[PDB]
């Protein structure tokens, strides 16, 4: 009878500006019309799970929910629990979860020259050198409209070598080689709690890449007041 609770993640609320809430208590036998509660210790109302089958065909399922709380409740930092009862264990099971900063460091890198030289595909990575706390979310943009989930993959944070308190991660998008060859700009919009606007957008393109030629004219004229 595995018992677990999924705390709300601020990463989620930046993507949709909404909070989806459902506790997770797995490996329990069949129960008809499962109804489970969610009450932080100072007395929030009771809510049952939604969009979860009360009895899956496999008979090893998880039917337990969380009350829909607003973002301000987690900004407060109050405690939270899903209390679950079923035929297997008449005694209720309770678990407690709660949230225990520096400006995130979000600068990406472009593809290598040899990647484009291979003329097969290209790799663009939204590296983040450091952030605090660990929670962070990355989403990729194209022409101002969200990109399909399948293209980009986001890696979990890791502790910085010289700053173990600081945490770093990365995300990858496997884009086509010829698509990057043309001038199509991308933005790897990330989502971090410790931000002024709560979201950071940074973009690149071939125009932003390594330049070769610099024909600075640097004209010198006695015509001084007027520009150009």
């Amino acid at each position: 009878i595995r018992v677990f609770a999924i705390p709300p993640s601020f990463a989620s609320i930046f993507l949709t500006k909404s909070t989806k809430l459902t506790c997770l208590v797995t490996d329990l036998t069949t129960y008809d019309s499962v109804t489970i509660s969610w009450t932080r210790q100072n007395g929030e109302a009771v809510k049952t799970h939604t969009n979860i089958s009360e009895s899956h065909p496999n008979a090893t399922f998880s039917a337990v929910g969380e009350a829909s709380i607003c973002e301000d409740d987690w900004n407060s930092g109050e405690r939270f629990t899903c209390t679950v009862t079923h035929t297997d264990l008449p005694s209720p099971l309770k678990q407690t979860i709660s949230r225990p900063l520096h400006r995130p460091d979000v600068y990406l890198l472009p593809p290598a020259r040899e990647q484009l030289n291979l003329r097969e595909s290209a790799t663009i990575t939204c590296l983040v050198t450091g952030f605090s706390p660990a929670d962070v979310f990355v989403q990729w943009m194209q022409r101002g409209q969200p990109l399909s989930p399948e293209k980009y993959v986001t890696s979990a944070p890791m502790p910085e070598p010289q700053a173990p308190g600081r945490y770093f991660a990365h995300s990858i998008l496997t884009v086509s080689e010829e698509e990057w060859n043309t001038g199509e700009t991308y933005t790897c919009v990330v989502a971090h709690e410790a931000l002024p606007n709560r979201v950071t957008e940074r973009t690149v393109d071939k125009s932003t890449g390594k330049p070769t030629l610099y024909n600075v004219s640097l004209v010198m004229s006695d015509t001084a007041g007027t520009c150009y």
Binding site: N181, T208, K210, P211, V216, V219, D222, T226, Y228
Partner: protein
């Protein structure tokens, strides 16, 4: 095809990171940043103050203008300073027109 990154008018700069396709084969296309600067060669140190020294040095740190010691008068902006005038012993202040061409009442 030019992307005008910066068009700062004080420190006249026209950085254009135009992409140039290389020959007939892509995948080695060259990117070039054309920092076209027009040093005035005659504007005063404090450009709004005509009585200031002459600019014998022009710093063009491109980092700052990408994101002030103004050098060249902007076309739209008017740079001017008060001047003393004496007609019959009366010292009356009045605004001047260091760039009269672009300072007509509009």
């Amino acid at each position: 095809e030019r992307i005008v990154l910066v068009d700062n008018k004080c420190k006249c700069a026209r950085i254009t990171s135009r992409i140039i396709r290389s020959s007939e084969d892509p995948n080695e296309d060259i990117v070039e940043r054309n920092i076209r600067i027009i040093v005035p060669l005659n504007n005063r140190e404090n450009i709004s103050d005509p009585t200031s020294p002459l600019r014998t040095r022009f710093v063009y740190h491109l980092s700052d203008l990408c994101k002030e010691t103004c050098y060249t008068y902007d076309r739209n902006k008017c740079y001017t300073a008060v001047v003393p005038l004496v007609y019959g012993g009366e010292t009356k202040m009045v605004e001047t027109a260091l760039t009269p061409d672009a300072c007509y009442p509009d």
